[PDB]
Enzyme design. Structure first.
Site: not given
Length: 319
Positions: A62, A182
């Site tokens: 690719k 968080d």
DNA sequence: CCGACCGCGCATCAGC
DNA sequence: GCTGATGCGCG
DNA sequence: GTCGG
């Protein structure tokens, strides 16, 4: 440096995950994009990249095609396919995974507007994700984090002074911007051998002072929701916040874990191996290849000491 | 050649 | 109503 | 899709 290649791979990853529902290919692609982004030379061929861990034969083909032609045929056919491009887009909505997306798209629901028309077909988490679609995709500038932390540590300290709270994530490493907030929470009366509404009490306070606006999900140990900073009468965007109540005797293992980086814990989890310990998200236990009981951890330094590793400032924990 | 590739808390649903 | 499966988000 | 046993 290799912006095209890593975009292409990241498109490929998004497509295996969301459309092909093949999560392992999704991590293979992004793994490959991760290492290629961290490569201090402009890749000049597929073979070249093949020398990288995570880049195999297929990705190498690719890269040759993308390099030679400036595009990828596989991706083109994919972007011009309404079904897979509409499933891929819908997953951007928190609460809509690969399965929900495909489901919607099979029955005509393709766009945000189609979702609003059909609110009655979304669950609660999804409705909230739809509501804050734009805001959730925004990054959180550090000085907002800082300001958000201040309220959260401040409101926890006010429910009960024994609460301990730590805002972790890349933010604890002093990254200029975070994606969410968080917080790790714990409390003396909470161990692996142990109160009734410890998380709740804290989620409420934050709701009571209008900092927490919506709940995605909430249980005895994990809270997922939305918060917002107060403004000066242009309101701030809404942001995602998690809040996790953790046993005191595993609290610091937690902190160390949710501070990362992913790679820093990798070189650490797999260095403590050399020296005779297994670290995980919860505990540091010795190896006999059989793991003994967890050792006492009173701070992050302790963990670093066990593997007699020099303590590494959260900041320098990039790798 | 072939399986691993994190695995867990919460919400919701599938199957009784 | 109950129990286990599945979807989803996330270090 | 890539890896390593």
């Amino acid at each position: 440096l290799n912006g095209g290649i890593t975009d292409m791979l990241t498109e490929l990853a998004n497509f295996e995950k969301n459309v092909s529902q093949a999560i392992h290919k999704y991590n293979a692609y992004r793994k490959a994009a991760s290492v290629i982004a961290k490569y201090p030379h402009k890749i000049k061929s597929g073979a070249e990249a093949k020398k990288l861990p995570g880049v195999g034969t297929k990705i190498a083909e690719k890269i040759d095609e993308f390099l030679a032609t400036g595009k990828l045929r596989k991706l083109e056919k994919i972007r011009q396919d309404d079904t897979s491009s509409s499933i891929n887009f819908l997953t951007r909505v928190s609460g809509i995974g690969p399965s929900a997306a495909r489901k919607f798209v099979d029955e005509g629901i393709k766009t945000l507007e189609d979702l609003r028309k059909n609110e009655d077909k979304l669950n609660h988490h999804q409705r909230i994700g739809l509501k804050y679609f734009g805001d959730f995709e925004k990054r959180i500038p550090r000085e907002e984090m800082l300001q958000m932390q201040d309220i959260v540590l401040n409101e926890v300290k006010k429910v009960d002074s024994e609460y301990i709270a730590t805002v972790c994530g890349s933010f604890r490493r002093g990254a200029e911007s975070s994606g969410d907030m968080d917080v790790l929470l714990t409390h003396p009366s909470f161990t692996s051998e142990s109160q009734p509404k410890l998380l709740h009490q804290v989620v409420e306070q934050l709701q009571k002072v209008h900092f927490i606006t919506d709940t995605l999900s909430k249980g005895e140990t994990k809270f997922m929701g939305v918060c917002q900073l107060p403004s000066k009468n242009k309101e701030y965007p809404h942001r995602r916040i998690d809040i996790r109540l953790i046993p005191k005797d595993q609290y610091y293992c937690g902190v160390l874990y949710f501070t990362g980086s992913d790679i820093f814990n990798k070189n650490m989890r797999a260095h403590a191996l050399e020296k005779g310990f297994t670290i995980n998200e919860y505990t540091i236990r010795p190896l006999g290849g059989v793991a003994g009981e967890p050792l006492p951890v009173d701070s992050e330094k302790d963990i670093f000491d066990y593997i007699q590793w020099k303590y590494r400032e959260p900041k320098d924990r990039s790798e």
